[PDB]
């Protein structure tokens, strides 16, 4: 298991939720399509960890993996203008590097927000620290792990 998922791990335990198990899947995994058949579910169950920076602080926002984020209803949610961040800024807030952010394990712990489209799952699999991770969670847990605000997000 790779220095990520080992870290992803530790840092579900050390929330109290390390009965949710990183899995590794085949190098050969970098797109959310191919992780979700890799273990069985629809790319809607995946959860994209993204993190964007604002005037006031930087902000996490779980995307359903079959929706995009709408930067629109973000902003009004989040109250600021909302903008894209670099390699560098990414790797420095969360710990992890662009492509495989989990959410949770933060240097930088994040105000966050979960498409609600989620909720629509019995189960969900997010970002193990790196593409070709992943531990799977209901709904619920993910909110009691980022204790993060349900809301509409997507395009429409």
């Known amino acids: 298991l790779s220095p990520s998922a080992r870290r992803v791990q530790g840092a579900l335990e050390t929330r109290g939720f390390g009965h949710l198990k990183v899995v590794e899947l085949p190098a050969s995994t970098r797109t959310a399509k191919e992780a979700a058949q890799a273990v069985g579910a629809e790319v809607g169950q995946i959860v994209k960890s993204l993190a964007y920076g604002g005037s ?71 970002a193990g620290g790196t593409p070709r991770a992943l531990f799977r969670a209901t709904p619920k847990e993910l909110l009691a792990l980022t204790g993060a605000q349900v809301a509409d997000l997507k395009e429409g």
Do not use: M
């Open 56 to 126: 006031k602080g930087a902000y996490l926002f779980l995307v359903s993996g079959k929706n995009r984020l709408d930067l629109g209803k973000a902003a009004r949610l989040v109250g600021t203008d909302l903008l894209e961040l670099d390699k560098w800024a990414v790797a420095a807030l969360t710990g992890f590097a662009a492509g495989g952010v989990p959410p949770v394990g933060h240097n930088t712990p994040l105000p966050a927000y979960l498409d609600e489209d989620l909720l629509g799952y019995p189960e969900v699999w997010a």
